Amino acid sequence: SISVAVRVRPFTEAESNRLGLRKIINVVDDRMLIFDPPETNPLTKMQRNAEHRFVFDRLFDEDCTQDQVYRNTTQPLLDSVLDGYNATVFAYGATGCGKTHTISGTPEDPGVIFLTMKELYNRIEELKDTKIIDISLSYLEIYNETIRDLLNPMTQCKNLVIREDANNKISVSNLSRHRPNSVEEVMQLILEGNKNRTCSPTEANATSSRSHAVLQINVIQKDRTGDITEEHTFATLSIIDLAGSERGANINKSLLALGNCINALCDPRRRNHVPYRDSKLTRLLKFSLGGNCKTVMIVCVSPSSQHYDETLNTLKYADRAKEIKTKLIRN
Ligand SMILES: Nc1ncnc2c1ncn2[C@@H]1O[C@H](COP(=O)(O)OP(=O)(O)O)[C@@H](O)[C@H]1O
Ligand SMILES: [Mg+2]
C-alpha cells in the first residue's frame, strides 16, 4: 500500500529568464501529467509538424503551497499514527528538486515535519481529557551506511546500532529523543540538525547529495479514564529526506535497497520476501514500509528541460512504484 505523489519545483529566476530552456512537464490535472509535452500554441504545433503520459495518485505543480503538499500527503496519515500504526513519507528525487524544501522547508515557509508537529500538538491538546500521550522526535543521518545523530553529533557512529527490540519495534541504540515544548523549537531543531548533515566533498555549506535524513516521531498513548493498565499504543511516523537520486558499494546502498524493497512490495509474488536487511535505511524501516504502514513517496522533479534525463528517470522510478498486475496461473 504505497502512495506516489509528484511535486514539480518551480523555476528559478534565471531558469525562467532563459525560456534556451522549455517546460518539460505539463501538469494536466490533480492526477495526470505529460512529460516532454506537445507544443501548446496550435499554430506553433502545426509548424512543428512540417511524449510520455503519467498518472499518479496526486500531483503538485510549481505554485503549490506547503500546506497543499502536507494536507494531501501526511495529514491523512495522522489518524493511523494515533491509532498505533506506523506511517512513512519519503522525499525522492534528484539534487536541487526540492526534497529538503518539502521535508524541512524554511522558517518562512515550513515543510512537512513542521506542519506534522503542529497538527500533532493540537490533536494532543484536544484529546487531553481522555488520553495520556507522549510525543517525541529524533533526527538521524545515514551516510555511507554510517548512522549519525543529527541532534547529538557527539555520539560515536559505532554506538548507534539498529536494534529490533521486543514486539515488532525497530530502534536505534543511544539515539537522542527530544520533546520540543513548542513549534518554534521544532523548527530550530530541524535547522540545527540539517546544519549537522555531512558536507559535500565539494564546496561548503553544501549538504552532501548522499546524505539520508530520517526524522522519526514517536507517538505513545494510553487511556486516561480507565484503570492503571499496561495497554498502550506506540507508533512511529518516519519523514525522510532521502539522498539524491541522480547517478564503494556503501555510498548508495540504502537508496538502492529502498528501491529494491519497493519493487518487492509492488510484486505480489515477492511481497513476503522483502529484503529490508540489505541496508541501514531499509533495516531501520523494517516495520515502516509494507502494507501495515501507510507509505507515501513524494517524487520531486525539475520542470527545466535541462534536466530531461534525470527527470524522466525519476518519473519512471515513480511509475514503477505501482503494483504489478499478476495472473493467477494454475497447475
Ligand atoms: N516549491 C518550492 N518553492 C520555492 N523554492 C523551492 C521549492 N523547491 C525547492 N526550492 C528551492 O530550490 C533549491 C533546491 O531545493 P532543495 O530542497 O535543497 O532540493 P534537494 O533537497 O532535493 O537538493 C533550494 O534553494 C530551495 O529553496
Ligand atoms: Mg536536500
Numbering used by the authors: 25 to 43, 101 to 131, 143 to 339, 353 to 436
What do the authors say?
Kinesin-8s are dual-activity motor proteins that can move processively on microtubules and depolymerize microtubule plus-ends, but their mechanism of combining these distinct activities remains unclear. The pathogenic yeast Candida albicans expresses a single kinesin-8 homolog, dubbed CaKip3, whose motor domain shares 60% sequence identity with that of S. cerevisiae Kip3. To understand the mechanistic basis for the dual-functionality of kinesin-8, we obtained seven cryo-EM structures of Candida albicans Kip3 bound to either the microtubule lattice or curved microtubule end mimics, and a microtubule-unbound CaKip3 X-ray structure. Our findings implicate loop-2 as a tubulin protofilament shape sensor that regulates conformational changes in the kinesin-8 motor domain, which can either induce curvature of protofilaments at the microtubule end, leading to microtubule depolymerization, or enable forward displacement of the neck linker for processive motility if the motor domain is bound to protofilaments in the microtubule lattice.
